[PDB]
Amino acid sequence: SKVTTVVATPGQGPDRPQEVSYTDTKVIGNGSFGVVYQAKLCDSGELVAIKKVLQDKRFKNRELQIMRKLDHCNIVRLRYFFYSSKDEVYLNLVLDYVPETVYRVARHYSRAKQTLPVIYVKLYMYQLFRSLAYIHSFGICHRDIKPQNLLLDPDTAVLKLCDFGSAKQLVRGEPNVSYICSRYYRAPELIFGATDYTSSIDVWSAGCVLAELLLGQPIFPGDSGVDQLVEIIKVLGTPTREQIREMNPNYTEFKFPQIKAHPWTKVFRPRTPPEAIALCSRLLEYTPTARLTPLEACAHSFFDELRDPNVKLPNGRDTPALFNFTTQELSSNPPLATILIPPHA
Ligand SMILES: O=C(Nc1ccccn1)[C@@H]1CCN(C(=O)CCc2ccccc2F)C1
Ligand SMILES: [Cl-]
């Protein structure tokens, strides 16, 4: 029956603080940056996650500034934020609580020697690509796409991208650090130490998630960058000098095993949908500019089942909102609306 009452600022809308009381506070992880609590809002009884992070006095929090601009069905919702306190200041991000992650669901299937039904692979990957299409339209790259950062409501099948702690607006000409993004999901250009990478690193990472959901395990594992590259070269083949330059190591000797392109069909298990494999090959490309855009991925034939008017979830419910595209979200390529928004929508 303990209640904490704070004066917190809404995430969206004008900077107008209000009194917010929450209860049933409990720790649900230490996210390196700080602690993450779960709580229940007294008024509505809705569950929230509170991400407590040490506030730098010098500059405003980049995660916060990005989160306040974002408003999308497939991105974790910032309800409130407030400051508290050691004698240092802590920023608290109050987020809509989502009970599961793709990581946890995938692992349950994995250690039961089962593959996740393709319907869920389609649903999760499509919603990820929508979230990426949205943030990329602002020039914002996530830079840490991985199964742990993909929240899931198992009932509604709604996926929400979270953890914008590494997220940044990439401006052509300005260099960016190459040591972001988690091991297994790092694009080759990042491994090669490129600082002139684009939002297409997120597409590579998304491709790694797709393959993982199909395979039941990470496609490019390895404790070192060298090990990872070998696993990449085993699938994609040895990168041509042309492809190397576009990834952008520049100065640093080449010298990889001269291995042939292992055909994509033999990578996955026998009855893996051909379109799933086709999609992978167009996401996991050496040349960054050669990779599909998020919006192009959404319109790929692998997701056709989702656009079928009779499609429903295995639990009987309707699919979540898949077609409520905005102008912002479609700006990369508006003509695609004729595929993305089907007749019945
Ligand atoms: O954290 C969650 N939801 C959430 C978090 C932040 C914002 C919205 N929703 C769920 C509830 C518990 N989850 C977990 O994966 C276990 C907790 C956990 C373990 C290790 C590292 C971090 C962490 F949060 C996923
Ligand atoms: Cl599920």
Author numbering: 35 to 119, 123 to 382
What does the study report here?
Glycogen synthase kinase 3 beta (GSK-3β) is a serine-threonine kinase known for its ability to regulate glycogen synthesis and to play a critical role in many intracellular pathways, such as the signaling pathways involving insulin, growth factors, and neurothrophins (Wnt pathway and insulin pathway the most known). In contrast with most kinases, GSK-3β is constitutively active, being inhibited in response to a specific stimulus, and it can only act on a pre-phosphorylated substrate. The central role of GSK-3β in many intracellular pathways makes this enzyme an exciting and puzzling target for drug discovery. This widespread activity has also led to identifying GSK-3β dysregulation as responsible for the development of many diseases, such as Alzheimer’s disease (AD), bipolar disorder, diabetes, cardiovascular diseases, and cancer. In this work starting from a 19F NMR fragment screening, two fragments able to bind the ATP binding site of GSK-3β were identified and characterized through biophysical assays.
